[PDB]
Design a protein around this ligand. Structure first.
Ligand SMILES: Cc1cccc(C)c1N(CC(=O)Nc1ccc(-c2ncon2)cc1)C(=O)C1CCS(=O)(=O)CC1
Lengths: 391, 456
């Protein structure tokens, strides 16, 4: 029984789901935008996930349990209904939907719907709405209230494809991997981070890219399922190794950040120095630990080229070791003659500019002095870059 | 790369929002009763309203908006602002990253309304009899100073059967246990969002009154006690995430939390305070080092001075805003810009400023100025007190002698992104300037505390 958690989409989603579960009318074909796959060491996880998927075909499983979830908090996703596709036609339909992207017709959803858990995860809210009024087939009398209740329960259930494209990045890899991982596997599997963190991690997941046989790009929910499901990133080694790479990158960044922060705090809480030197130390240590060149070096050290963890093209992070040559404060201050030096290589004199102008004795001393231009007066102490005691 | 210094923040807030209080410690409905009908603050009984505080400090553009996004993406909370502009700003910021709910003001929640806006606050005396600072007395005087709105809110809440949670609890007792009341907020939308979560993330919390933290805690416990919400039943305490800049946002929540001696012990700021020292606004050497000095109270040298050595008449300064000191000066500049431009030979004229409109986007009208119809805001000049909390790129500061502060200089000079679009008058630095060393010294001492975490 392979477990397949799927975030579906419709052309309202809540009304379609309620109609589909009740007895049917309002049943719109669902669009499996993101689908999960798991069954009950890191290499073993990679091989299991890769064998569960297939390079040529889809999910390799004779029996499929497919939980359908929407966006909202019960948890980023919340189960909406549960279906078991065990019949051969059901398995074929699921294979053609998860891989090719064909939407599931209402008849397949109704026939494969497992009433037990599907209504066991909703009888609580059915009783809640019954108490509010004082199975869910009795919503004909009170229907808009039920609609509002499921709108509030599943926040983000009804969203536009433009929303998905804007949130989860414009790129193929970013879209598929960030969406699937962040929305489903973060809760399923640690890595409870922000969407920006997942998008940046997927950005440096430089696995070999191959152009699609045809050139298409994502209006309304008619195309994004085919855009995402048939992509080479949602199947095989990429899908098998993306969570592993996210975990490895998170662990590496956390260990380097902690190693830097220990020294940063220790050599900050023990300085018996002036406030100016203290601020200089803080802004020098933050530059020494997070310089754009050093951050780029760390990113190129932690990036991988192959999904398989066995290859492990990632190199050890040199950020801490590079910071060692500067964090030697065992004891013009040492912090100044570093800060200025530091600033020069990353930013930009009176003598040279005066040599360029060859105004002390020249005619230009009065070229801006007597020319008050009508502002104020004290003239040729209300001193005169004029009118001082402007920018 | 501030995505990894935020996970200690997440851990600490989740730990602080999970601890359960004792039954004898949580407030009970009887405390709100007989105080709702009480007339004078003198009859206020000594009662404790437990609460927890997490603080995010820093300067504008320090990444202080991404932490709110993370909190409202992995923790259950209600994002709330001191003003509507701030609420809209974080709504745009966070709804540009993930799902967002309409961020209501601290006025919309908390029960605050239009009639509550106008009140004769502060006309009730209070003498601190005990040891100078104690939680009982401080909360009681915060309620005393803000008594009119608190009294009206309690009367409205208790006067206006509230079985939304109790009916579900009765059914769970008959049957399920502590699982059906969690779906109550999703069934009845009329409920305040303070019922849904004990964490209220506040952005620009330094603009809220010193007295207003206790009022928010009081009315939150009020809604929690009348409605009998599961967080109140399991004895959860408020965990307000106050995000703001004490050195810029100006007798206020941030100052009350940082400077008070006993709130630093009860709330334990040392273990629940993060300092952000990044600044995405200014990215250049000189200006960056001067803002430093202006925020941390560093000694004034002769380089940062002279750095500032490198307006009233609109004759030739098109497309700039002016930050006058007093409101009368702003009204005068409105009387001048809408009079000189009358005969400029993009304006031609026709309530928040003095009046007459300038057509610089205010371009057309028909009345329906392009709308609920003709009241709009003129951003051409605005006062230094209100200058904070906004984002501009055409500032032209107009300091005056005699009342020249450095905190105001400070606020008015960092509103712009680049220093090239900066114009001024007689210099704030040098001359006679008044300094507030308390907040800068407190921030520096916090920076020398190993318990707090700092994130770039
Ligand atoms: C700290 C840092 C880390 C990594 C990379 C860089 C680029 C830097 N920055 C930028 C910086 O400091 N910006 C900033 C500006 C103003 C404020 C502020 N606003 C109000 O009050 N304060 C706060 C932060 C530097 O400047 C370096 C340059 C070399 S250095 O001088 O040795 C160390 C600091």
């Amino acid at each position: 029984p392979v477990e397949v958690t799927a975030l579906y989409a419709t052309d309202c989603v809540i009304t379609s789901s309620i109609a589909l579960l009740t007895n049917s009318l309002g049943a719109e074909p669902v669009y499996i935008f993101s689908y999960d796959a798991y069954t009950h060491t890191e290499q073993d996880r990679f091989e299991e996930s890769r064998a569960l998927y297939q390079a040529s075909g889809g999910l390799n499983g004779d029996s499929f349990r497919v939980t359908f979830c929407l966006l909202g908090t019960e948890g980023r996703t919340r189960p909406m209904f549960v279906c078991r596709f065990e019949r051969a036609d059901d398995v074929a339909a699921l294979q053609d939907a998860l891989a090719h992207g064909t939407p599931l017709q209402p008849d397949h959803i109704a026939a494969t719907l497992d009433a037990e858990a599907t209504f066991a995860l909703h009888a609580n809210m059915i009783l809640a709405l019954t108490v509010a009024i004082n199975l869910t087939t009795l919503y004909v009398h009170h229907e808009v209230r039920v609609l509002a209740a499921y709108r509030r329960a599943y926040y983000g259930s009804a969203q536009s494809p433009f929303w998905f494209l804007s949130k989860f990045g414009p790129d193929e890899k970013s879209l598929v991997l960030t969406t699937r991982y962040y929305l489903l596997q973060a809760q399923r599997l640690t890595a409870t981070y922000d969407l920006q963190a997942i998008k940046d991690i997927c950005a440096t997941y430089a696995i070999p890219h191959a152009p699609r046989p045809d050139t298409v790009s994502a209006t309304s929910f008619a195309a994004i399922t085919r855009f995402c499901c048939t992509s080479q990133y949602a199947r095989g080694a990429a899908a098998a190794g993306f969570p592993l790479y996210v975990e490895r990158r998170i662990a590496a960044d956390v260990r380097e950040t902690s190693a830097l922060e220990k020294f940063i705090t220790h050599d900050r809480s023990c300085l018996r120095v002036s406030d100016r030197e203290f601020i200089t130390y803080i802004y020098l240590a933050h530059f020494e630990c997070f310089s754009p060149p050093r951050l780029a070096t760390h990113l190129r050290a932690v990036t991988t080229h192959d999904p398989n963890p066995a290859a492990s093209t990632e190199q050890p992070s040199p950020l801490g070791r590079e910071a060692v040559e500067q964090f030697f404060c065992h004891v013009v201050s040492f912090f100044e003659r570093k800060a200025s030096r530091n600033a020069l290589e990353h930013f930009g004199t009176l003598t040279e500019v005066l040599g360029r102008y060859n105004p002390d004795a020249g005619g230009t001393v009065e070229g801006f002095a007597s020319e008050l231009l009508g502002r104020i007066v004290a003239c040729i102490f209300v001193a005169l870059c004029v009118s001082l005691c402007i920018d | 790369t501030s995505m990894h210094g935020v996970q200690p923040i997440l851990k600490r807030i989740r730990e602080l929002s999970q601890q359960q209080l004792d039954g004898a410690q949580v407030p009970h409905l009887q405390w709100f009763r007989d105080v709702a009908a009480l007339e004078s603050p003198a009859g206020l009984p000594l009662r404790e309203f437990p609460f927890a505080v997490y603080l995010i400090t820093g300067n504008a553009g320090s990444g202080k908006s991404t932490c709110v996004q993370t909190i409202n993406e992995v923790l259950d909370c209600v994002v709330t602002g001191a003003t509507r502009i701030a609420a809209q700003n974080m709504y745009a910021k966070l709804s540009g990253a993930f799902l967002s709910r309409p961020i209501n003001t601290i006025f919309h929640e908390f029960g605050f309304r239009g009639n509550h806006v106008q009140a004769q606050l502060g006309q009730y005396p209070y003498t601190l009899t005990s040891n100078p600072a104690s939680l009982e007395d401080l909360q009681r005087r915060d309620l005393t100073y803000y008594w009119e709105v608190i009294l009206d809110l309690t009367k409205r809440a208790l006067a206006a059967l509230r079985n939304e949670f109790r009916a579900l609890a009765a059914l769970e007792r008959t049957l399920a246990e502590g699982a059906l009341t969690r779906l109550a907020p999703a069934t009845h939308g009329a409920l305040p969002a303070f019922t849904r979560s004990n964490v209220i993330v506040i952005d620009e919390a330094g603009l809220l009154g010193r007295h207003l933290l206790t009022a928010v805690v009081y009315c939150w416990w009020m809604i929690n006690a009348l409605y009998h919400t599961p967080q109140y039943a399991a004895r959860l305490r408020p965990v307000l995430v106050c995000v703001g800049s004490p050195t810029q946002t100006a007798e206020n929540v941030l100052t009350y939390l940082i400077c008070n001696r006993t709130l630093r012990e009860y709330a334990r700021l040392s273990y629940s305070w993060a300092i952000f020292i990044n600044n995405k606004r200014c990215v250049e050497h000189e200006f960056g080092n001067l803002m430093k000095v202006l925020e941390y109270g560093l000694p004034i040298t002769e380089e940062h001075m002279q750095f500032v050595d490198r307006i009233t008449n609109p004759a030739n300064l098109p497309g700039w805003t002016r930050l006058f000191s007093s409101h009368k000066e702003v009204s005068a500049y409105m009387a001048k810009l809408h009079a000189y431009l009358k005969v400029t030979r993009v304006v031609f004229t026709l309530q928040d400023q003095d009046a007459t409109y300038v057509l610089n986007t205010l371009m057309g009208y028909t009345p329906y100025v392009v709308v609920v119809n003709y009241g709009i805001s003129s951003k051409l000049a605005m006062t230094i007190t209100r200058s904070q909390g906004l984002s501009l790129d055409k500032v032209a500061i107009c300091f005056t002698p005699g009342n020249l502060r450095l905190n105001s200089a400070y606020v008015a000079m960092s509103r712009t992104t680049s220093s090239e679009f900066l114009r001024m008058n007689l210099n704030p630095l040098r001359e006679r300037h008044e300094r507030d060393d308390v907040i800068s010294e407190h921030i520096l001492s916090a920076l020398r505390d190993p318990n707090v975490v700092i994130v770039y």
